[PDB]
């Protein structure tokens, strides 16, 4: 899920049933959305679909342009961004 920490915002989600092309991480203003949709036409007789949609608020001290995302081999999606810190 979402974890706000002293020096970063991060979201970690299980997305093992989705290929990278089936995932979308949208950052617009101070909102992050994560979406996934996976469909299988198993056969002549039908299909299965699964999907998810999540939305989170980015704290004001995270520049949304600094948000990035990566996907691990075991299917965990991480979205993260640094918070402004003292120099």
């Amino acid at each position: 899920g979402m974890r706000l920490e002293k020096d970063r915002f991060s979201v970690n989600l299980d997305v093992k049933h989705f290929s990278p092309e089936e995932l979308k991480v949208k950052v617009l203003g101070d909102v992050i959305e994560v979406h996934g949709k996976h469909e299988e036409r198993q056969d002549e007789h039908g299909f299965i679909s699964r999907e998810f949609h999540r939305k989170y608020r980015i704290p004001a001290d995270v520049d949304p342009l600094t948000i990035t995302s990566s996907l691990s081999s075991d299917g965990v999606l991480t979205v993260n961004g640094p918070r402004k810190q003292v120099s």
Partner: peptide, 10 residues
């Protein structure tokens, strides 16, 4: 060993 997931910003 992570794959970068591009951010959609529109």
């Amino acid at each position: 060993g992570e794959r970068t997931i591009p951010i959609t910003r529109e």
